[PDB]
C-alpha cells in the first residue's frame, strides 16, 4: 500500500542486511 511508496527508497539501505 502506501507503504511500498516509500520502501522504494529504503532500499538502498536494504543492502545493510
Known amino acids: 500500500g502506501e ?3 516509500a ?3 529504503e532500499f538502498a539501505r ?3 542486511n
Open 7 to 9: 520502501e522504494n527508497q
Open 14 to 16: 536494504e543492502l545493510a
Open 3 to 5: 507503504e511500498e511508496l
